[PDB]
Design a protein around this ligand. Sequence first.
Ligand SMILES: O=C(O)[C@H]1O[C@@H](N2CCN(c3nnnc4c3sc3nc(N5CCOCC5)c5c(c34)CCCC5)CC2)[C@H](O)[C@@H](O)[C@@H]1O
Ligand SMILES: O=C(O)[C@H]1O[C@@H](N2CCN(c3nnnc4c3sc3nc(N5CCOCC5)c5c(c34)CCCC5)CC2)[C@H](O)[C@@H](O)[C@@H]1O
Ligand SMILES: O=C(O)[C@H]1O[C@@H](N2CCN(c3nnnc4c3sc3nc(N5CCOCC5)c5c(c34)CCCC5)CC2)[C@H](O)[C@@H](O)[C@@H]1O
Lengths: 592, 288, 591
Amino acid sequence: NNKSLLYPVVSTSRRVVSLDGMWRFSFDAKSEGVEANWANGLPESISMPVPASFCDFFTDKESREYCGDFWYETDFFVPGEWSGKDIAIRFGSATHHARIFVNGVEVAQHEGGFLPFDAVVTDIVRYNQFNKLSVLLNNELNEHMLPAGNTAVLSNGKKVAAPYFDFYNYAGIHRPVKLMALPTERILDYSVKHRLTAEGAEVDYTVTTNGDHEVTVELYDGTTKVAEATGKEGTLVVKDAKLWNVHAAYLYNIVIRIHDGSAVVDEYTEKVGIRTFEIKDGHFLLNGKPVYLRGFGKHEDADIRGRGLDLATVKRDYELMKWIGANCFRTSHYPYAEELYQMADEEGFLIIDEVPAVGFMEVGWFEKETTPQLLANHKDALTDMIGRDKNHASVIAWSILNEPQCTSEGTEAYFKTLFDLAHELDPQKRPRTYAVVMMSLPNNSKGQQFADFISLNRYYGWYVMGGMGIVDAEAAFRKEMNGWAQVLNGRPMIFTEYGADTMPTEHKLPSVMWSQEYQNEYLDMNHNVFDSYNFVQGELVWNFADFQTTEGILRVNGNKKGIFTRQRQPKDAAFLFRARWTSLPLDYKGNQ
Amino acid sequence: IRGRGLDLATVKRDYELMKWIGANCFRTSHYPYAEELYQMADEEGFLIIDEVPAVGFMVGWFEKETTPQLLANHKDALTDMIGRDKNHASVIAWSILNEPQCTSEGTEAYFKTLFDLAHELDPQKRPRTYAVVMMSLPNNSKGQQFADFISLNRYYGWYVMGGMGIVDAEAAFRKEMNGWAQVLNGRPMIFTEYGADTMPTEHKLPSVMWSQEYQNEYLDMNHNVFDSYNFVQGELVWNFADFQTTEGILRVNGNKKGIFTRQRQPKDAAFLFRARWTSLPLDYKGNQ
Amino acid sequence: NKSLLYPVVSTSRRVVSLDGMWRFSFDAKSEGVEANWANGLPESISMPVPASFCDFFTDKESREYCGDFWYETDFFVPGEWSGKDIAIRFGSATHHARIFVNGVEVAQHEGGFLPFDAVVTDIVRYNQFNKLSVLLNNELNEHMLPAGNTAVLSNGKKVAAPYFDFYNYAGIHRPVKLMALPTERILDYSVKHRLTAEGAEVDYTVTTNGDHEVTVELYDGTTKVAEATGKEGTLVVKDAKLWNVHAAYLYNIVIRIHDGSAVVDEYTEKVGIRTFEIKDGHFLLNGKPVYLRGFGKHEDADIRGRGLDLATVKRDYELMKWIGANCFRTSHYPYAEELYQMADEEGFLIIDEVPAVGFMEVGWFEKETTPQLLANHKDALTDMIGRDKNHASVIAWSILNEPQCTSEGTEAYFKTLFDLAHELDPQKRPRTYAVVMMSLPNNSKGQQFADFISLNRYYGWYVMGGMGIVDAEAAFRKEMNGWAQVLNGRPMIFTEYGADTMPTEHKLPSVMWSQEYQNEYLDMNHNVFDSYNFVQGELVWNFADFQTTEGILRVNGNKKGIFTRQRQPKDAAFLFRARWTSLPLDYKGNQ
Ligand SMILES: O=C(O)[C@H]1O[C@@H](N2CCN(c3nnnc4c3sc3nc(N5CCOCC5)c5c(c34)CCCC5)CC2)[C@H](O)[C@@H](O)[C@@H]1O
Ligand SMILES: O=C(O)[C@H]1O[C@@H](N2CCN(c3nnnc4c3sc3nc(N5CCOCC5)c5c(c34)CCCC5)CC2)[C@H](O)[C@@H](O)[C@@H]1O
Ligand SMILES: O=C(O)[C@H]1O[C@@H](N2CCN(c3nnnc4c3sc3nc(N5CCOCC5)c5c(c34)CCCC5)CC2)[C@H](O)[C@@H](O)[C@@H]1O
């Protein structure tokens, strides 16, 4: 097996052709497509852009909320000059459950809507001809998948997603689909670990190939070689290394090659930032110095396109995060497109990487009969995420769950499995966390013991004791924080969520909940609490921007806790954060 | 700005809007209004259902230790409201409670005192009613038997089975109506409340709850049910205009179920209601 | 070797997209060329392509930058392409472009809305990476399309001063594609349709840069239905399935150069068979009258400016179908080819418009730079018709938007361009232009050249709005009585009418800027349209709110959209849906 999660690159040995554009599309309400031969051509179809969720193109709700099997189809050319090479199709992701057919032959299956996979087609494609690519997708939710939920059936027989999570169940092909030509012997993986030294830095590496020819690794500052090594394991000695820092990124160029004499059998290239990250004495140390995390929980969410990758929106989001003085964000509730991490690497932003283990909430959750099948799917996602993302300088922590019912029996065995795995799989041994739900308190949470740092999602002053009660909210908040003080045992804490829904058009004096003035007051109270406790070492606000949810009486066209609108313009709270975050030192509270 | 203060400019605008939209009736939802509002109803020819502030009556409510003292305050309010308003041509019925827990033990004793009193005090013996909460069903309400006509407050498609569930909301609404048909004993029914919160600035296609398109679709679904049942003889929508509530996660600067904004300007739904209500004859369904 | 054909992959051709994150730098001092920036930017930021650069930034100075700026990327040329011609296609580059590869300047282009190629066969290194550097300039002048001025602020910074009502978005707005092509290749082809008793016949021409034999084959699906040899010929299609409004049918055309048993080059494309002509004051599509209904659009969306985004295109078409439109005009510049491909597939009619907007104030067409403007106008008309002529959806050419056609010099300028459009278009489709409010039946020197008249009128908005709307209708009806006397049996459509409308505003009774006023305005205008037999189409301004330069009249851009910029309906969208889906396709087609 030649599994590889490496980003597709063009090199002397590798080719890449994007298959994005307008595809053919059809719902399959009776699940008849396979036996009816739809993999060889849809009888009826519409056009559908890839990448994008399908939901928000339509003007009818039945299509927006379709839940079941659906098909994507396109034709791709395979140049004849590729005939010596391995041929594969990379899917950045496909949501949620995928079956891939090429020329009518089923060539791949995949579980989980937010991580990449390849379909090898070397012996199925016709060369110098067009070939049919058919993708049978399904977007139904069940209780043993990431993310977790249910599928209901309406009184008219129609299926509808019923998530256990607070975001719309967007599905489709959300990320670029890329046809690749690869040499039969090739680099499948590599890893880097960094060490600071008196003369500079040292990068310890491994490379994994599917063959035995010789491996070299060269490191370049621009076009100037600064270090090289031979062998699948080694050390790169970088004199006076230029370290990657917050808002001061520096990226070297790594070149990995397989050699057969004077012939280069395979070349893989990628940017690499050199930096250390670790928890010591209740602080996050980046290159040996403390950093106070500030930023957001985000979503892959925008108007029209659902979760589809859009480099324009990504660019605007980073411009806004720099303007506001953020330095960190969490990939709230699923791994993002690789491109978002690539830009974080360039811009000097810190990332907490999170698998889609959200909705594990109300017998308690971790005693359900399906817990073993869920754990399997969870290990798979955790493995692929760490494998895909481990070499990004920007990625500094792993978040293993969001708001699980960690008061349930069965929590310890479940968490121990996954937290050990995260330790095993990450060569850099980055810290591990999970977002603690409101119902899980210092005194009853069976899961908090496993985290290297505690991440709280708290809504004191919104879901509890909002409005005129915010005085009581603050007192109840401090009460819980005194509880955490007794179980932390020197570990740091961050907030991964806090926020208040806010209509971007709403002004009131005095404030009311849903007004911009209330949002500012809400945030000031929370920051007063944060600043009161030595062990609070970061604040990520919920959310960067307004985003879509299922309809309900609580959701005024989606979630309105954004600091920015869905159109990436600031609410009043954006200027409050800008004043706070740009005025706190990078090492705020670093001596506490 | 003025809260509940009387302001004849606003009253005048409210009547201009009710005439424009084709309304003929309103209920004094949750408390008796200032006299001037009934005087204008008399001048313009509107029907009024007069309601005392017996709202919030959530051990069941009517087994509480303070029930005797509540009843005494309720008797006084009913007496002064009928005493003050009985001579208005516009006032044509008495609403004695809004959404009491009329499944509670002790409901019958409390209701009988008050409904008997309303009969004794009114020289014109106008019909008596109360707004029935959603949890009070044909098969478990101990209070509906007292009403001369039934007034339902229903939110099928808002609080219950909203959004993509509206198809289920309509089915459950019809089933419950089928159950009311068996207890009405020939009495008429009106809806005193139905509605959906709507930001006056929100448009979406397809609709989402809180959009003006959802408000229109919600109203259409409900009207289709109303029109299916011969015994439905009136429809009062909640609410005429956005109004202030206590702060809360459910209230985007107060209640937004208004057909008009708090500034007395129409949302899309006002044009839906204008087209419907001005097209129905005054005696719509009068032979059914 | 000029060719405006859409880049395709075939047995002889390769295409690799260069879209993604590029490097970018402003060049405020215009120093980059002499400073060797083409071999690498000293300082740079990342920038998505395709997109406008403007709306990413948080500072106004960057959003409003006017001058030289650079885009750069590295691109791989596979060694297996040796022997092929290597070219980089730019869908567009706004406004004035100089292209460098490995430090060598290989192309220049004028005009920000039409494609061009940079041939780099002998400049690139094979099986290696090469540096692509793009020096762009977005300054406006009075002799370009579109027209404007570039002002200098008191701090010395330049700022665009358009003579047109849309923001001066610039950047690389459309896909950049690297191509490998055979040295002898198809450069162009044209089709021309005729209906017959037995089906349809397609008269074609093909242009190549060589002498080897040419064949043309037409396939229904995979099923060949016609073929022919020669650079000119006819394809006989029995029982031809015609392309129709909201009912498209597309055949596949395959053009090949042959050298014995070898296919030297192959080009493929979809083609819809249909006729379109003006007869007795009506638009005839496949011989039957069509009443045009729809919009003026823009290439405009949140964040990306005029950047191509298939997601927004798909939504726009879903909304146009939902509302009952059948037609739009490419308001004030040719759009990305992808929009026309979708119109071919969905059965939408398009009026293709060149960026000849801003020609207004000695009168405009007596300005000293008039001959320079005309030359740029001819090139854009040449490239637009050459690019778009084989689209079944394209059924008319708009040669200008609101020129001062009352000016001296109008006749000689217009004749040149209306004659040229016939020389450029084998199908001889109807030609028009959008007539400004100040140009009336009795004083317009331009209107006589149009095959159908297109009016932009704002009776009830810019003229006699509000309580004056009763006078606006009377003045409108008088002007229409005047047009009746000069039409000479020609049809008329409205290409613009509309009223700015905040999507949040309700008032009873209406005020200008409220949704109720927008509805009343449209009702008044439609009452007038329906009073005149010669009105054969209505295109409202605009499909969606779009960005303009800042100003007291522009509440964050133009608010005349029927949809918001986020593609949600205002009240008037429901008004149009009820009207446009109630009108028969051949509405007013017998009068
Ligand atoms: O919601 C958000 O914005 C985001 O927050 C996170 N999660 C936080 C907790 N969570 C809730 N979501 N919705 N409602 C409530 C909670 S908890 C809670 N507790 C409540 N009471 C506690 C006991 O005393 C009285 C108050 C009440 C309510 C809620 C709402 C109904 C009435 C009272 C799920 C989402 C998610 O990580 C994030 O993906 C999501 O977007
Ligand atoms: O609310 C209005 O606009 C107006 O309506 C009337 N009253 C209607 C019912 N009433 C409610 N107020 N707020 N929330 C709920 C109800 S009932 C209900 N049922 C619910 N579930 C029941 C079981 O099945 C599924 C649905 C849920 C909720 C509510 C809210 C949280 C989510 C689930 C009190 C006010 C008042 O006469 C009026 O003065 C007031 O202004
Ligand atoms: O504007 C739009 O929305 C769109 O319309 C088209 N164009 C139409 C006319 N045009 C104008 N733009 N702005 N203002 C005026 C005009 S004409 C006119 N005439 C006026 N008076 C003439 C003499 O009698 C009394 C009325 C007055 C005004 C205007 C403005 C101030 C009040 C008096 C240029 C743009 C463009 O093709 C389109 O790209 C643009 O987006």
